[PDB]
Amino acid sequence: SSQIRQNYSTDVEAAVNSLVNLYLQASYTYLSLGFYFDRDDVALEGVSHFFRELAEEKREGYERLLKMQNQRGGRALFQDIKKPAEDEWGKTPDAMKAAMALEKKLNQALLDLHALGSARTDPHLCDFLETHFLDEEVKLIKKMGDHLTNLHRLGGPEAGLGEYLFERLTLKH
Amino acid sequence: SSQIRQNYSTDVEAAVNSLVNLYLQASYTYLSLGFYFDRDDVALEGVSHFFRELAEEKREGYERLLKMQNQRGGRALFQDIKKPAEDEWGKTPDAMKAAMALEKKLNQALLDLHALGSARTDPHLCDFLETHFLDEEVKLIKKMGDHLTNLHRLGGPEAGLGEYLFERLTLKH
Amino acid sequence: SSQIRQNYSTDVEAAVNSLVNLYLQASYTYLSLGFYFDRDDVALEGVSHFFRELAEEKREGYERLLKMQNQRGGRALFQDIKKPAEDEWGKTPDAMKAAMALEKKLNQALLDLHALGSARTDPHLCDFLETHFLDEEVKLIKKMGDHLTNLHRLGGPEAGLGEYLFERLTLKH
Amino acid sequence: SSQIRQNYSTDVEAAVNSLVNLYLQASYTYLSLGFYFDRDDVALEGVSHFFRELAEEKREGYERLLKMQNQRGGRALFQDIKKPAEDEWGKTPDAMKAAMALEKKLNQALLDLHALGSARTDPHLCDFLETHFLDEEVKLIKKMGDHLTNLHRLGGPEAGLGEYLFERLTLKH
Amino acid sequence: SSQIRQNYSTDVEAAVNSLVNLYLQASYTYLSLGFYFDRDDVALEGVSHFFRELAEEKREGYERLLKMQNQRGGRALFQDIKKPAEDEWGKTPDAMKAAMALEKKLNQALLDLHALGSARTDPHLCDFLETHFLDEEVKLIKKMGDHLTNLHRLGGPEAGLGEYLFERLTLKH
Amino acid sequence: SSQIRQNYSTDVEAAVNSLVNLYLQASYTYLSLGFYFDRDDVALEGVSHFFRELAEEKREGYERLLKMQNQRGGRALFQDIKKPAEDEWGKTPDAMKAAMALEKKLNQALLDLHALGSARTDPHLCDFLETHFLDEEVKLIKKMGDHLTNLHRLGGPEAGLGEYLFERLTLKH
């Protein structure tokens, strides 16, 4: 019986906790991707930095969701965080594809949450998602798409050379 | 037959004028709360300042609603402003509870207006409420909730001491 | 039995509360005048700004009266605030005449309060009114008089042109 | 089969391309209005500048729509741009009325697009329109309304004098 | 019967309006080229920026022609703007070739206009074209020629790698 | 068969991965503690900030371990992250005791790792632990001990008052 709770569905509260777990798992996957590219037998600093930055971005994501949960009077409930799907992530193209699939999953979860909020007529939740999540995802997915396109353009018999050039000329280091 | 009016329901126009009266009444209640705590036999400067600041916040609220009314081609209609519910507001906890109830009433009025706008398919009104009102209310109610919790933690046989400490260590002065 | 009260008549206390209501009502009238001139079918920004500034001036007026009430040990008592006399205020000359009548009413109320204080031999009240109210009113009424004179000079068959020029060349925008 | 496309209706994609053509046509109309008032036999610099600035505003509009189209995975499709409705635009009042009608058409197209997005449950599109278009239109239409009101106030037997004063005292030059 | 018109042929006036339409169409083609390279499945930022900058350059071109038309007493006449020749522009080399052909067309139109002005003994028109157009075109065509040469040097079995390197090392981003 | 691996036991490699999981779990517990104290019915900002800062500290811990793992040629292996032991953490004293027990567990794990490294004669590992972990833990545990002592000193019948004062006067906010 939270003293501040108003127009906040128990369904949305539960969905927010689920989304928090999804972001914790996503941040975890990027942590893994980040250090994989830091291995001496992979060594692509720009790629490592790219994923480590995304791990931080997802952390800000669940921290923002957690803050909002408390602002609305909801109660945070944490569950085990599932380990990443892979121990090794292949080459840059393979890793970027995995990252892309992860973002699409996150984006669908955000869209599902927004639809749920809309169904429960919760304009504050809608505004929150639109302001801090929806466009951020679209921009990120667009960026990954651009990266995949350039990596594919740099593929072929000399993909190794291409992978090196991409990390050196497109990614920050 | 306003030359600029477009997709602005007469129902929303009326609801906006009603909301303006609600904010005028809210600002009035905070003016009363502000000076009550300025009385020599109450003397809690931090509490007085807290409510006087909220009176200013509600004023900005109705001024923004009034500006929007004109931007949409609506016409402002003013009614008598009902005096505050109390002449004396008790102790800090009692006043904060009254303030909390007032904000919840304001917030429900905002949610009702948003639902009305949604029913009349008025995206500009929705955007306006989400940008300048909805989150402001949630943050304020959360803050009042935190205050009530600390005041309750400082209650008991030495509530007087607690009330003094709260005004001195939590509220601005 | 206020511990600080000294030489403060219950009559003056009551008159101060009445004056506070008069100023709240005056500020309300200027709020209405301000937004009326902000209407798309009136659109005289300089005039709107002129009245909105006066609304702020009257607010400072009742806030000062309220502060003084507490300094003297009096107790603020609020009543309903009567809505403005008009929903639409006509043209600049009509609005300025209404504003002038309002200020003369306020000024007479201040003079009546001063006479009451003088009759109850309350020099602090007298000093308060002379320092923060009496000259402010005289200057404002003089200014409105000057405005009415120029508006009358700009009247006639081309009053519309005159009204535009006055707002553009005399009023701030 | 865009690799980044997610929750983006082919209907919205098509409507966005249509809206882009509408903005290209609007920018074109303002280009025409801008130079018409630059003619030696019209010569109203402030009016010319007003419309030339709007031409730039509409350009930013279609460029933003185009950028969003690509962010969502949609594909830009361009069509012929219809020439302006008039070769000569009359006097300031006539031109401002045409501009007003154009903005109302643009605004209705934006509202129609928003309704379409809402029907296809596309919160990103909604957020995009609310953030960069809806309020911009309302403010602009309000401004044009104010201009028409002042121009009408300056009309009559000495409309020429009025038109000159308006360009000199209200419009930037 | 323009009061300022002097030594300005109706033929040149007409040719200037035609050239304005040609530049509007050119700017339109570059807008299309610009966003095509912004597609997630093309993603060559440097190329996108190159063409978007040219779209701005052509806009300045027709705006300058329009200004001159009015300075000479001529009257601007706008026609429909034909859509770009292609919806998709292929790879960087294909797009640059299209851009080159477009510039050569523009340049021939400028040379034709200059010859017309020379035939009508209009030294002001000649000076105008030489000062703001002729050398700008020559420099641009030279630059595109250099680009095509480098792109051809980077062609072959690993053209994809070449295209990426060109965008990264020659074009601005 | 890492090309850089030298004097790095597979046992230490495994223990480092285990320790990384322990730190991930610790950071998770502090995230939970942090937001629990952010609840409107707990509301102790200084306490919330204290734990949120520790969550960041543990993150830096596992990131440093991960970096070292790669520097030595080891391979990071991630496992599920167990959720925190409690959903609600009681009062400040209860939470600080839990935090203290957690740090002692972490410290014992560090001491066990150091003993393992010593047994495998790995001076680099020893130096790493001494430089970035051992003293940091001792200082933190000392600090928590001091906090528990002051909280106990502030206990009794007016523990609520004590808890408020501690958060206000000892913890940062």
From Swiss-Prot, chains A, B, C, D, E, F:
Binding site for Fe cation: E53, E56, E57, E60, E63
InterPro entries cross-referenced by the UniProt entry: Ferritin, Ferritin-like, Ferritin-like_diiron, Ferritin-like_SF, Ferritin_CS, Ferritin_DPS_dom
Domain Ferritin-like diiron: 6-155
Compartments where found: Cytoplasmic vesicle, Autophagosome; Cytoplasm; Autolysosome
Keyword flag Transferase: no
Pfam families hit by this protein: Ferritin (PF00210)
CDD domains: Ferritin
Spans annotated as Catalytic site for iron oxidation: 53-60
UniProtKB keywords: Acetylation, Cataract, Cytoplasm, Cytoplasmic vesicle, Disease variant, Iron, Iron storage, Lysosome, Metal-binding, Neurodegeneration
GO biological process: intracellular iron ion homeostasis; iron ion transport
Similarity annotation: Belongs to the ferritin family.
Protein's name in the database: Ferritin light chain
Source species: Homo sapiens
Protein's gene: FTL
